[PDB]
Homo-oligomer: A and B are copies of this chain.
Amino acid sequence: GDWSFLGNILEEVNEHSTVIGRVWLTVLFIFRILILGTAAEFVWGDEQSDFVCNTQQPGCENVCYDEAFPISHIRLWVLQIIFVSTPSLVYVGHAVHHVRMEEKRRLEGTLLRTYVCHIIFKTLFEVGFIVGHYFLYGFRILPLYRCSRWPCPNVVDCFVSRPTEKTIFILFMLSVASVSLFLNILEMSHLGL
């Protein structure tokens, strides 16, 4: 997809942020969005097309693929990016609002609170998405999925496409998110000092 607008706003943010914050935005762009667009999206391109179940029951493949993957990982990661970005948008909006107010007439006591809260919310969203991914899928995609969802007769064997590659990228994204967390915590500590 096209991320140009979000990139515009976030680049604008870069100016109004801590050094750790600029590192965080660089990470967001390079190791999440770029990889999604150029590496991961191709990996999941044939997720359902090459999902194959050992049966001749009509509709069994559509229901078994939907059971194994209620939301695809790539879409989960899209949502994750958007939600961890939103607070930064809030903060830069507050900043530009104060700027226009001063013109009509940096991290002051008024902004500081908003900035800290935005770091806090980035952290909360990151942790939430990581936990949700863990419970939904674990962190490994196994090649065999056994499904007993109607209309499938008894339990059928279905086989996932590219399970090892998908696992590699799952773990890669997990690590990127953990790095984001570390950065957020160090930024809170730096402000504290």
Contacts and interface: CB of A to CB of B under 8 A. Distances in A.
Interface string A136-178: 0000000000100000011111000000000000000000000
Contact of A157 (B54, B146, B154, B157): B154
Nearest to A53: B56
Interface string A39-63: 0000000000000001111000000
Contact of A154 (B56, B57, B155): B155
Interface residues on A, range: 10 to 19
A87 to B, nearest CB: 48
A88 to B, nearest CB: 50
Nearest to A52: B56
Contacts of A153: 54, 156-157
A58 B56 CA distance: 13
Q: Which of A56, A154, A155, A157 has the most CB of B within 10 A?
A: A154
A57 B156 CA distance: 11
A68 to B, nearest CB: 16
Nearest to A60: B54
A64 to B, nearest CB: 13
A156 B153 CA distance: 7
Interface string A112-125: 00000000000000
5 contacts: A54-B55, A55-B56, A146-B154, A154-B154, A154-B156
Interface of A: 54-57, 146, 153-157
Q: Which 10 A-B pairs have the closest CB atoms?
A: A154-B155, A153-B157, A54-B153, A56-B56, A154-B154, A54-B56, A54-B57, A54-B55, A55-B55, A154-B157
